[PDB]
């Protein structure tokens, strides 16, 4: 059982990647809502967990954490400062070239769970919600990524939409 992300145009099979990290923004009950960050390229460049590929929202082929997920922020109390999320196990996404890329559902849910755990240990014992992007430009509203000099765009909704206690 898997999650099928649309991607326009069709990413070749050879661009199949490993997801290693994320960037998130914190929105303005014990419910804190996070979105895939729609900030400029500066935040991504300065997360330094981005790694190798030129991607938005997700980081591919990048460096993994040592043991557990580690999250970083330049000010947890300033909503305007992004949170860089670094995983320990990568999430393989295999593109078929039919215009969509596949992710394991169980795998992504466990990833989200661990991220939420680390987020709780930062903001407190609240409810971690993940919602889709906030809009802005088509650049950062979608999971963008560069492969072999081509900049593909994928939809992130199915990844960024769950609730955890």
């Amino acid at each position, epitope marked *: 059982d898997t999650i099928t992300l649309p991607c326009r145009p069709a990413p070749p099979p050879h661009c199949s990647s490993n997801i290693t990290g994320l960037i998130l923004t914190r929105q303005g009950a014990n419910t804190v809502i996070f979105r895939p960050s729609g900030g400029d390229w500066r935040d991504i460049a300065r997360c330094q967990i981005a790694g190798t590929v030129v991607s938005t929202q997700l980081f591919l082929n990048g460096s993994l954490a040592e043991e557990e997920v580690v999250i970083r*922020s330049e*000010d947890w109390r300033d909503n305007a400062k992004s949170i860089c999320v670094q995983l320990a196990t990568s999430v393989e996404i295999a593109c078929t070239g039919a215009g969509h890329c596949a992710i394991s559902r169980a795998k992504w849910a466990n990833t989200l769970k661990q991220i939420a755990s680390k987020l709780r240990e930062q903001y*407190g014992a609240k409810t971690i919600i993940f919602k889709p992007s906030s809009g802005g430009d088509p650049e950062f509203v979608n999971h963008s990524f560069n492969c072999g000099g081509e900049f593909f765009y994928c939809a992130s909704t199915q990844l960024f939409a769950s609730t955890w206690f």
Partner: antibody
């Protein structure tokens, strides 16, 4: 176990330069943000400065602004506060605090005394 | 910005509450509210964070609450070890960490 041990302090003259040091151990120093606080003998706590993990977000207090300068070195797991043009009003015990996000400050260093007198 | 009572007293076994008052800035903007204990010549120790939460290891006699413009730290079954200074801390409207005026708890013996 989390441990913050501070170095520096002592007598300084009105207008001198002192650099306080804080060594951290027992946690990824490179992950947490940090803070400097100070307390005048027989007065309360006053947040001095804040330094990000990336050292790109630095914040100062209106008083020390222009005269104090925070820094850090992740290679040595160390935080530093440079105090220049010291006034007698800056005589205090300086503490090394770790940012706890919603907890504000969570771990403190033992504290070191700085006495500015001429 | 945060005002506390200078001094509070109570007997062994009794309970006492320490206030921390403000307005639209600190306790009236976000739930970032912490209480630190300080013994003579030692460093502050986090006793309560996020209004009510208690770091593991701290006795369940310490509790915290907030009522808009007034944070409150309650201590039940006073003992000698409680005798110390206490500070509230918060995050201001304009991203500024602010401490309380400090309050001395004396265990009346």
């Amino acid at each position: 176990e989390v441990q913050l041990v501070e170095s520096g302090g002592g007598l300084v003259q009105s207008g001198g330069s002192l650099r306080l040091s804080c060594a951290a151990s027992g946690f990824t120093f490179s992950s947490y943000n940090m803070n400097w606080v100070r307390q005048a003998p027989g007065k309360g706590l006053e947040w001095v400065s804040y330094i990000s993990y990336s050292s790109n977000t630095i914040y100062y207090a209106d008083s020390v602004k222009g005269r104090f300068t925070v820094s850090r070195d992740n290679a040595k797991n160390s935080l530093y506060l440079q105090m220049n043009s010291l006034r007698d009003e800056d005589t205090a015990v300086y503490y090394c605090a770790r940012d706890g996000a919603a907890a504000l400050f969570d771990y403190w260093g033992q504290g070191i005394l700085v006495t500015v007198s001429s | 910005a945060l005002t506390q009572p200078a001094s509070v007293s109570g007997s062994p076994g009794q309970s006492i509450t320490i206030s921390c008052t403000g307005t639209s800035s600190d306790v009236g903007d976000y739930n970032y509210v912490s209480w630190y204990q300080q013994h003579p010549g030692k460093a502050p120790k986090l006793m309560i964070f996020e209004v009510s939460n208690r770091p593991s290891g701290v006795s369940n006699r310490f509790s915290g609450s907030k009522s808009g413009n007034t944070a409150s730290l309650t201590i039940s079954g006073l003992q000698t070890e409680d005798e110390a200074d206490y500070y509230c801390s918060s995050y201001t409207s304009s991203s500024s960490l602010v401490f309380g005026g400090g309050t001395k708890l004396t265990v009346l013996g």
